[PDB]
Amino acid sequence: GPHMSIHSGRIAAVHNVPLSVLIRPLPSVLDPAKVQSLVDTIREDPDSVPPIDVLWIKGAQGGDYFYSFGGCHRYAAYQQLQRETIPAKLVQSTLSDLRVYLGASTPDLQ
């Protein structure tokens, strides 16, 4: 008869997040022309610019941490526009997910 199964996975949700709340551990590789292209697009058609992906990690005592590894050109463009917030897809993630990026540097988040 009808379908047996469902899809289960981590929760993601789009939010306007303060640039300032994002932890950005790694240097950004940026094509200056691409940053400028994004600044122009944000000005004229911001809905066409997708939210940046952010790892939302809850620490051992429930603290919230928001890590940002990609989205570098968009982050740079919002910074150049002096924006307070940026559209971000907050993807619920774990310390083991974070380790994929930080390895032995992964902090014992509280």
The edge-to-edge listing of strands for the beta sheet with 64-67 is: 12-18, 85-93, 52-58, 64-67, 22-23
**Cα–Cα dist 30/35, whole Å:** 7
The alpha carbons of the chain give a radius of gyration, in whole angstroms, of 16
**Cα–Cα dist 105/2, whole Å:** 48
**Cα–Cα dist 22/86, whole Å:** 10
Task: Please indicate the experimental technique that yielded this structure.
Answer: X-ray
Crossing angle (nearest 10°) for helices 32-44 and 72-80: 60
**Cα–Cα dist 56/67, whole Å:** 7
Q: How far is CA 52 from the centre of its chain?
A: 5
58 forms beta bridges with: 64
Per-residue tokens: 24? 């950005």
Q: Does 11-106 carry CATH code 3.90.1530.10?
A: yes
Domain ranges of the chain: 11-106
* Residue set of the binding site: 71-74
For every residue of the chain, DSSP letters joined together read -----------EEEEEEEGGGEE--SPPP--HHHHHHHHHHHHH-GGGSPPEEEEEEE-TTS-EEEE--S-HHHHHHHHHTT-SEEEEEEEEE-HHHHHHHHGGG-----
Residue carrying the six token digits 């993807």:
91
* Residue set of the binding site for ATP: 71-74
CB-based contacts of 108: which residues, under 8 Å, 6+ apart?
59, 60
